[PDB]
A paper describes a structure:
Mimivirus is the prototype of the Mimiviridae family of giant dsDNA viruses. Little is known about the organization of the 1.2 Mb genome inside the membrane-limited nucleoid filling the ~0.5 µm icosahedral capsids. Cryo-electron microscopy, cryo-electron tomography, and proteomics revealed that it is encased into a ~30-nm diameter helical protein shell surprisingly composed of two GMC-type oxidoreductases, which also form the glycosylated fibrils decorating the capsid.
In the 3.3-Å resolution map of the asymmetric unit, most side chains and notably the FAD cofactor are accommodated by density suggesting that the oxidoreductase enzyme could be active.
Numbering used by the authors:
A (entry chain B), B (entry chain A): 56 to 700
Write the structure that this text describes.
């Protein structure tokens, strides 16, 4: 028997903060159901480099996100825009959730995304305190090793940002309007100050820096360890070995291996929750006040639909007997990021000194920069505010070795063994495609529901006059346009690096080796010779430009369209399944019911400006104050932090 | 309350026969738990062409094996031999199991596989009656439309089989030793008799025919319908709408949507089985005599391991509390088939007449032949009996259109729109690789367990002398050798077709367009100039043949090794997870327990000579007589068949 008045389902990035700070500041009885044990002893979780497979057995060399004993394994339906490939993108299965298996990065997101895309009450000035709270809770660190490649790249970026600042055009990709004429590029010399990307006031929307902030901490011995939600908020100092709380937190219960099925639900009010344990028995817990769903973006709409909230026609079709509320918007608007990869060759006799000091330590995890960039000059899909507000579009990442898939490694002829290649990535942060989630069987939580997500689709013309069917091709082709413009933005960095490396003491040469170089120079020339309407040549049957130059450009675009489909990576930043306004109101309460709330990343109405870990924790932190009634977390002094064991 | 003395889990190809003929011939109380409703009204299941997506909604065009509401969706761990790609291969989820979503083909398997690879009591003369039983139960039909391409191919096969019969070599791929000197190729002219591939006496181990036997039946209206296990054995004539039996079968209960978890198991004797229904409640059923597991190859070891039979150390590690029997061989020896694809171009002005009468009707489903072939002359991995017994190695299939993946369609430049291309496939029936299955969470039946299956791995040499490390490279390279020899066997058919099409009234030319033609002629020349030790050049660091010709051959082999990895298809013929001798004895009884048996395809000790649907039904049929005690099914007259509603 386990009656309690707050029941949280899932201890992820948001569940842990919620439980911890909700039992600290009140006397209600909190229950946390997670379905996964605590990996506080596993060397593959505590050690940061275990992310790269240092402790893997020889015969089962698979990463944690491919291990069914560490992660939920959802595979999406064939991708009609990527040659119908199905992708498996995972969720963490442990205390701490996906933060137990992630890359440990802290992009906070810009100021402008919250100011312009989130509803009132969620503007940036209303949430910055919670971001400060989560950052102070973790205390990330910076890179502990310098490298001259970062120097060369930073000089190149400032060199071309100088000419972008002039020329008067307003929406180039290195223009930050909160700083003014001077470029927002970190200085590169002895004793240079560090431009902080997650700054408090949100000044830096577009900036170039030399290091990220990764969530690890150094021990007195010398070893580094992971610092995740389950490490800080539910550790042996705050919770017993039996799951009971201790002292201040004695009003807290955590059940370890408890897979939750649905919400037994009297009238339109929640009254009980059932789950299954490792024994195989079914248990019921009684609810007095509130149910919180923090089960992740893929599996929150699933449990909501199984309970009875969703589309009545479909749910009746598959066989859900108990219907509650007819909201056909549950599980809509799924969003994600997407990172295409380019890689560059260095030609010379003694390039080793140029690529030295790049191996992955636990303080950077192979990230060496390099910045956040805004919209390209020639992208037609921009918000109207772009003239007066700087948005975040691309996240630039530089890494050693090759990062393409193994099949592409064979096909392109470039191998990971050689030592004159390095990778650049322009991750898309405002990715356009939208998908959705539905369940297929109303029995128990299934590992694979129906997930639909099509990215790089094409446009099939009609007999409509060309003048009035361009502005549907624009929307249908947005992602391909953005990926190609990212290719161009990376390409026009490398000759700047040529100049900088020449005048910094290096006899080296840099060229883009993947995709093929000529295929990129042709894109550069096509862009600068066709202007703002360059993208019309994606559909060659409407341009009516039958000249051989136009045919060349169209063929180049068609050939380039292959690379982002196959030689890229879909990220694991799922969100917005049950966003604000769609499924829940500003108070995180589900429409059509009076005592259930959803507070994980699946409630965000727009993805943040980068990696989506701070946002989920912030949502949980604000849910704490929403539930209790008055702001206690928002006013805690920053010197009060959870101690670590 | 549902006590009964026989409880079957899963109504697949073997569960339906077992339940039907076990309640017909006895008075025990039979219960069948399936976890899936009856699709007797769904047009996408009853109509054969619904397999190809005739009734699919426009926005969700996915086949039945990719639909989570029709199939279990297991994805295997990254394939170290295929550029680390994860493949999703499904199981049927309905009455009838995988036969509700399959291709409807009836390869029975040869005589020699059962005579040489299965234990005593399971030789061919001990089982042929049950194969006749299942075939008479279904009554498949042959192709209802002729085509001249089959004529040309059959002439070509007999032409080269004539010269293979001479030349005295004993193990070519068109030699059948049960017929003698004359070729075993169907005659090709007016009123020719039909050589039956599933013949009663098992004479035809290697034969060339013009049609397969697909499991459909024609109605009086004119429409064809699917004829599967759930259609024949559990239909409205034998089982009520409520799941009760009727009259003769009144001693039978079928529960529709019941997902089974584990076996509650007193002492070392089975006493109860628990399941979950669509309501979300957990039910228990009492067992008096027997439990049958017919849950498929992927999910039978899963339920056995969750119950408590398996490896104690690992099961304790993941958290199974109740341990029963320590058999570390549960879930070992997983086998499957594998089909690489080649495709051929026809060059000429009026090839349309040559490729006419090839569209897929419900009586062939785009299969137009062409035979079963034995070992190639130059394969080193052959059983010792191969001199005196003919084994089945390849299954040859001919089809219209292109059958490669969409990515390969783009890369190779060949498109499905054009009308001068057709596909050939040499499916490997004695596929060498072996994998295994383990569970990752002891809570509930998960859709994705750990499945390990690596196919086309490479050999890394050591400092061991070359003379005494060849016979480990042979075993490690068996699958690649077999695939390449299949490529060669297909290639040396097309010039025979050149001659036959010339002398049959056609001005057409045939050449292998995928893989590239020169890459195949070089393989042909390398084979005939390097002899039986041609495969030594897979590892170029040991041959010590530094001549440029040897370098050419090694490069050709390395380039050809890419095609079977990416341009092929893994089949859905899983088997042998709990085979005879490994997990169960000759009586299908699980070792370490006295009242549980497993009777689905996961009990086969060696895959059959072709498509694995007749074998599963045969196993169920023999289990019927094993359970009752005396042969009632083995002596039923062939004119007694289940009527159809
Ligand atoms: C491969 C990978 C890489 C990542 N890289 C980064 C990165 O570079 N930067 C970054 O900032 N973030 C990264 N992340 C993390 C990710 O971006 C966010 O942290 C994530 O969205 C956190 O959201 P969440 O806490 O709401 O969900 P989760 O953390 O996934 O919470 C899910 C929790 O709910 C539980 N649960 C689910 N279903 C049930 C059920 N039926 N019953 C009971 N419990 C249930 C699960 O066990 C788990 O504890 C990565 C994640 C992965 C997997
Ligand atoms: C895509 C595809 C193509 C195929 N093509 C061919 C072909 O060309 N030729 C051919 O001969 N065969 C074909 N097959 C069929 C296949 O080769 C065999 O018929 C199959 O191995 C049948 O084995 P089975 O009956 O033991 O397993 P299944 O038929 O898969 O039986 C599984 C049954 O167990 C049930 N079950 C599983 N787990 C549970 C659980 N926990 N609780 C309750 N019930 C459970 C499932 O609901 C299902 O009813 C194809 C199958 C597929 C999927």
């Amino acid at each position: 028997n386990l009656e309690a008045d707050i029941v949280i389902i899932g201890a992820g990035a948001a569940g842990c903060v919620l439980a911890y700070y909700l039992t600290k500041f009140s006397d209600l009885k909190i229950i946390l159901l997670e379905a996964g044990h605590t990996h506080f002893n596993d060397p593959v979780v505590t050690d940061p480099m275990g992310f790269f497979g240092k402790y893997n057995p020889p015969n089962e060399n698979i990463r944690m996100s491919q291990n069914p004993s560490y992660a939920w394994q959802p595979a999406l339906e064939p991708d009609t825009g990527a040659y119908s490939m199905r992708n498996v993108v995972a969720h963490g299965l442990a205390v701490g959730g996906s933060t137990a298996i992630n890359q440990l990065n802290y992009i906070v997101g810009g100021r402008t995304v919250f100011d312009n895309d989130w509803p009132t009450g969620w503007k940036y000035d209303d949430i910055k305190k919670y971001f400060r709270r989560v950052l102070a809770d973790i205390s990330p660190i910076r890179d502990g090793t310098k490298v001259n490649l970062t120097n060369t790249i930073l000089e190149s970026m400032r060199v071309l940002a100088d000419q972008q600042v002039s020329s008067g055009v307003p929406v180039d990709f290195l223009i930050n309007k909160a700083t003014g004429g001077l470029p927002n590029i970190e200085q590169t010399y002895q004793g240079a100050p560090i431009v902080n990307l997650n700054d408090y006031e949100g000044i830096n929307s577009v900036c170039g820096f030399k290091s990220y902030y990764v969530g690890v901490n150094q021990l007195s011995d010398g070893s580094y360890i992971r610092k995740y939600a389950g490490n800080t908020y539910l550790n042996s100092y705050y919770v017993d070995s039996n799951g009971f709380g201790i002292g201040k937190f004695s009003n807290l219960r955590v059940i370890s291996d408890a897979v939750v099925d649905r919400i037994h639900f009297e009238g339109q009010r929640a009254v009980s929750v059932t789950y299954i344990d490792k024994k195989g028995n079914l248990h019921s817990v009684k609810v007095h006040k509130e149910v919180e769903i923090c089960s992740g973006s893929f599996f929150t709409p699933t449990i909501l639909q199984r309970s009875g909230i969703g589309d009545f026609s479909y749910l009746s079709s598959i066989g859900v007997p108990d219907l509650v509320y007819n909201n056909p918007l549950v599980g809509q608007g799924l969003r994600n990021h997407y990172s295409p990869i380019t890689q560059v060759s260095v030609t010379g006799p003694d390039a080793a000194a140029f690529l030295s000091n790049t191996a992955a330590g636990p303080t950077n995890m192979s990230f060496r920069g390099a910045g956040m960039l805004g919209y390209h000059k020639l992208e037609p899909n921009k918000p109207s505010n772009a003239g007066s507000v700087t948005y975040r579009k691309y996240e630039l990442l530089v890494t050693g070795g090759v990062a393409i898939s193994a099949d592409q490694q064979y096909l392109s002829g470039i191998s990971s063994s050689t030592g004159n290649y390095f990778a650049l990535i322009a991750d898309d942060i405002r990715f356009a495609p939208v998908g959705y989630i539905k369940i297929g069987t109303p029995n128990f939580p299934r590992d694979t529901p129906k997930i639909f997500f099509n990215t790089f689709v094409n446009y099939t013309p009609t007999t409509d006059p060309a003048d009035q069917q361009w502005p549907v091709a624009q929307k249908t082709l947005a992602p391909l346009i953005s990926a190609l413009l990212g290719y161009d933005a990376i390409y026009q960095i490398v000759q700047q690096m040529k100049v900088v490396a020449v005048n910094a003491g290096f006899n080296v040469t840099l060229q883009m080796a993947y995709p093929p170089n000529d295929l990129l120079v042709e894109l550069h020339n096509g862009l600068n010779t066709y202007g703002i309407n360059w993208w019309h040549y994606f559909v060659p049957s409407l341009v009516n430009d039958d000249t051989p130059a136009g045919k060349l450009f169209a063929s180049t675009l068609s050939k380039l369209s292959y690379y982002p489909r196959s030689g890229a990576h879909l990220d694991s930043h799922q969100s917005c399944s049950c966003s604000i306004g769609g499924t829940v109101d500003t108070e995180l309460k589900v429409i059509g019911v009076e005592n259930v709330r959803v507070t994980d990343l699946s409630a965000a109405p727009h993805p943040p400006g980068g990696n989506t870990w701070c946002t989920a924790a912030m949502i949980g932190a604000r849910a704490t104050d929403l539930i209790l009634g008055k702001p206690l977390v928002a006013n805690l002094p920053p010197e009060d932090v959870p101690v670590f064991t």
